[PDB]
Amino acid sequence: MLAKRIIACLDVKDGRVVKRDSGDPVELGKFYSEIGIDELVFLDITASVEKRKTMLELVEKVAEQIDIPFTVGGGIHDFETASELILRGADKVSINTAAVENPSLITQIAQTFGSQAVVVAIDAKRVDGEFMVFTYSGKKNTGILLRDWVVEVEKRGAGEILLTSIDRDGTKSGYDTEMIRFVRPLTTLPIIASGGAGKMEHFLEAFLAGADAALAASVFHFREIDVRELKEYLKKHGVNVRLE
C-alpha cells in the first residue's frame, strides 16, 4: 500500500534558499533527503532575466547530487520552459496561472513527458460560500469554481494537484481539511495539501481528509518540526509512512 508523503518546499531566489539567506538550496535539499523528507518542491522567484538559466542550473545540480523525487516551479509559463526543466533533470514541473489561462499547456507536457511530470498548483479561496480558483499568487479571483477546475485539470492530463488554501497559506494555523474533503471525491489524482502546517497533528488531519501528501516549509526549515518524530507520530496514529 502507498505511503503518505511528507514534502518539503524550498523557496529559492537568485541561487539561494530564502527564509535573507537560508543556505544553498542543494545542500538544504541534501539535508532534507537524509532526515526523512519524501520529495522536494523548489519554487523560484528570481527575476526573469537570469531566471531561465538559474532554475536550469538548480535543476541540474539537484538531479545529479540528490537522489530524491523533486518538482520545480514558479513562473513556468510555456511548454518550452517546462521541457527544458524536465530534460535538465526535474522529475516534475508545477504550473499554476499559466495552467488556468492556457489549459492545453497541461496536455502538451503530459503528452511529451507523461502525466506524472505535471503538477497543477491550484490556489483556492472561499468567496461567498463557494470555492473559487485564484491566479497571480492568490491575488486574482478568476470566477472559476474549484469544483470545475479540478475536473478539467484531470481531464487535461495532470498527474498531481498541489492544493493550497489561500486563507491558511503563511499561517501556522492548520491545513484546510474542509477544502481537501471537498476536492477528494472530485478527482482520482494525488492531492498535496499545502498551506497552514503548524503542528504534527495537522498532517494527521490532512491525511484523514484524503490528502495523499503534505507540504510544508518553515516548520521544517526552522528545525521547528522533526520529520522523524512526525513520521513516528503519524505511524502510531495508523497512517502509512516511509520510515527512515
CA 64 to chain centroid: 21
CA distance 160 to 175: 18
CB atoms within 10 A of CB 207: 24
Would you say 87 and 59 are in contact if contact means Cβ atoms under 8 Å apart? no
What lies within 8 Å, CB to CB, of 72 at 6+ separation is 41, 42, 43, 44, 55, 58, 59, 85, 90, 92, 93, 94
Q: Is the dihedral of CA 19, 25, 28, 33 positive or negative?
A: positive
What lies within 8 Å, CB to CB, of 129 at 6+ separation is none
Report how far apart the first and last C-alpha atoms of the chain are (Å, whole number): 17
CA distance 203 to 205: 5
> Which value in Å is the resolution of this experimental model?
2.1
Per-residue H/E/C for the chain = CCCCEEEEEEEEECCEEECCECCCHHHHHHHHHHCCCCEEEEEECCCHHHHHHHHHHHHHHHHHHCCCCEEEECCCCCHHHHHHHHHHCCCEEEECHHHHHCCHHHHHHHHHHCHHHEEEEEEEEEECCEEEEEECCCCEEEEEEHHHHHHHHHHCCCCEEEEEECCCCCCCCCCCHHHHHHHHHHCCCCEEEECCCCCHHHHHHHHHHCCCEEEECHHHHCCCCCHHHHHHHHHHCCCCCCCC
- Indicate the burial class of 186 (C-beta count within 10 angstroms; 0-12, 13-18, 19 or more): middle
CA distance 127 to 135: 14
CB atoms within 10 A of CB 102: 14
**Ramachandran region, residue 15 (left: φ > 0; alpha: ψ -120 to 50; beta: rest):** left
Residue whose C-alpha cell is 501528501: 213
Nearest to 43 by CA among 95, 3, 6: 95
Q: How many CA atoms lie within 13 A of 141 on its CB side?
A: 9
Chain breaks in the chain (C to N over 2.5 A) after: 19
| Catalytic one of 44, 123, 176, 212 | 123
Q: Active-site residue 11, yes or no?
A: yes
CA distance 184 to 195: 17
CA distance 120 to 70: 14
CA distance 143 to 211: 25
**Ramachandran region, residue 85 (left: φ > 0; alpha: ψ -120 to 50; beta: rest):** alpha
Q: One-letter amino acid identity for 223?
A: R
What lies within 8 Å, CB to CB, of 67 at 6+ separation is 33
Determination approach: X-ray
- Indicate the burial class of 142 (C-beta count within 10 angstroms; 0-12, 13-18, 19 or more): middle
CA distance 196 to 198: 6
Number of residues that this document lists for the chain: 244
- Indicate the burial class of 139 (C-beta count within 10 angstroms; 0-12, 13-18, 19 or more): exposed
CA distance 75 to 98: 8
Nearest to 135 by CA among 109, 166, 160: 166
| Catalytic one of 11, 44, 91, 176 | 11
Radius of gyration of the chain measured on its C-alpha atoms = 17
